[PDB]
Design an enzyme around this catalytic site. Sequence first.
Site, PDB file in Angstrom:
ATOM      1  N   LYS A  65     105.068 -26.338  73.450  1.00 28.79           N
ATOM      2  CA  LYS A  65     104.188 -25.463  74.610  1.00 28.79           C
ATOM      3  C   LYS A  65     103.789 -27.423  76.045  1.00 28.79           C
ATOM      4  CE  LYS A  65     101.729 -23.406  78.175  1.00 28.79           C
TER       5      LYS A  65
ATOM      6  N   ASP B  19      90.258 -14.958  77.936  1.00 28.45           N
ATOM      7  CA  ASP B  19      91.176 -14.940  78.402  1.00 28.45           C
ATOM      8  C   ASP B  19      92.192 -14.670  77.466  1.00 28.45           C
ATOM      9  OD1 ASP B  19      93.493 -13.639  80.501  1.00 28.45           O
ATOM     10  OD2 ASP B  19      94.791 -15.762  80.282  1.00 28.45           O
TER      11      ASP B  19
HETATM   12  C1  LIG Z   1     111.658 -12.259  68.025  1.00 31.00           C
HETATM   13  C2  LIG Z   1     109.868 -13.335  68.723  1.00 31.00           C
HETATM   14  C3  LIG Z   1     111.334 -15.021  69.051  1.00 31.00           C
HETATM   15  O1  LIG Z   1     111.864 -14.615  70.424  1.00 31.00           O
HETATM   16  C4  LIG Z   1     111.722 -15.316  68.245  1.00 31.00           C
HETATM   17  C5  LIG Z   1     112.427 -17.088  68.716  1.00 31.00           C
HETATM   18  C6  LIG Z   1     110.257 -15.366  69.574  1.00 31.00           C
HETATM   19  C7  LIG Z   1     109.417 -15.860  71.135  1.00 31.00           C
HETATM   20  C8  LIG Z   1     108.985 -16.438  71.577  1.00 31.00           C
HETATM   21  C9  LIG Z   1     107.386 -17.098  70.517  1.00 31.00           C
HETATM   22  C10 LIG Z   1     106.769 -17.765  70.881  1.00 31.00           C
HETATM   23  C11 LIG Z   1     105.648 -17.876  69.252  1.00 31.00           C
HETATM   24  C12 LIG Z   1     105.299 -19.031  69.260  1.00 31.00           C
HETATM   25  N1  LIG Z   1     104.609 -19.392  68.342  1.00 31.00           N
HETATM   26  N2  LIG Z   1     104.035 -20.095  67.982  1.00 31.00           N
HETATM   27  C13 LIG Z   1     103.188 -20.313  69.009  1.00 31.00           C
HETATM   28  C14 LIG Z   1     101.818 -20.915  70.212  1.00 31.00           C
HETATM   29  C15 LIG Z   1     102.482 -20.216  71.835  1.00 31.00           C
HETATM   30  C16 LIG Z   1     101.799 -20.188  72.551  1.00 31.00           C
HETATM   31  C17 LIG Z   1     101.844 -20.216  73.818  1.00 31.00           C
HETATM   32  C18 LIG Z   1     100.830 -21.198  75.289  1.00 31.00           C
HETATM   33  C19 LIG Z   1      99.832 -21.182  74.787  1.00 31.00           C
HETATM   34  C20 LIG Z   1      98.942 -21.575  73.641  1.00 31.00           C
HETATM   35  C21 LIG Z   1     100.486 -21.551  72.594  1.00 31.00           C
HETATM   36  S1  LIG Z   1     103.434 -19.318  71.783  1.00 31.00           S
HETATM   37  C22 LIG Z   1     104.273 -19.159  70.504  1.00 31.00           C
HETATM   38  N3  LIG Z   1     107.222 -17.215  68.734  1.00 31.00           N
HETATM   39  C23 LIG Z   1     108.092 -16.830  69.474  1.00 31.00           C
HETATM   40  C24 LIG Z   1     109.284 -16.210  68.814  1.00 31.00           C
END
Ligand SMILES: CCC(O)(CC)c1ccc2cc(-c3[nH]nc4cc(-c5ccccc5)sc34)[nH]c2c1
Length: 243
Positions: free
Chosen positions: A35, A125
């Site tokens: 992030k 939120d």
């Molecule tokens: C099919 C799902 C896929 O397209 C695979 C690449 C996908 C899409 C978006 C994300 C986001 C994550 C993800 N894993 N861990 C976190 C933490 C995130 C986060 C975002 C904003 C503030 C705090 C944590 S997003 C995220 N895994 C994904 C997996």
Amino acid sequence: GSVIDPSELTFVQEIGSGGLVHLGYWLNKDKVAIKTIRGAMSEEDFIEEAEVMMKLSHPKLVQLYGVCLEQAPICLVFEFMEHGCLSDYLRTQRGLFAAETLLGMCLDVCEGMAYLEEACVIHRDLAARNCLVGENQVIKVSDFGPVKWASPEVFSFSRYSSKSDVWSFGVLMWEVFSEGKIPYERSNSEVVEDISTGFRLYKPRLASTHVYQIMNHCWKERPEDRPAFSRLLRQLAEIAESG
Ligand SMILES: CCC(O)(CC)c1ccc2cc(-c3[nH]nc4cc(-c5ccccc5)sc34)[nH]c2c1
């Protein structure tokens, strides 16, 4: 603490946007979600939220590997969640979900929120967009470190408490059972005046009478009338045990 050097991280593909979310690797081994900062939002506050998230340990909360401070833009190193965002996962797999599976997702969010309630941490939120899906459909709460999800105390007097997050959980419960539908799909001041009049979100097809009753208890006008996350957890478990 937990400081990660920028050379240790390997950027693979952009997976999210708001800052940006990238799929990557830490030390060329672990799958990580990076992030990065946008511009808007303070650099110190972004690290202040990460220090809070690294101190709270629960199986239903997203875990952080560390923080990159050396090179700007600064970034947070999160654990990779296979299925990503809950709101997007519900829309893509719409019509393939069972009532038992949707209730199980709500129980996962309520588990993490009950831990934050005892630790006296307000989410501020809580939404399906801020929830992540891992392996075996496990749901974890993120961003724990938009008036549609807000309670009357929040959109009028900005009074944040554990009971205001209960209102947000009620709106979250609606998003799950409606399979990723947008709540009050309508401008900000239109919905803020609609809620005070007595208008709430409609009953989803997948949700039962007992499930919708719990949603309305979260949607009570007074914060004291709303049940605590500790009570809601046992109430949601009783439906799963019977029907
Ligand atoms: C099919 C799902 C896929 O397209 C695979 C690449 C996908 C899409 C978006 C994300 C986001 C994550 C993800 N894993 N861990 C976190 C933490 C995130 C986060 C975002 C904003 C503030 C705090 C944590 S997003 C995220 N895994 C994904 C997996």
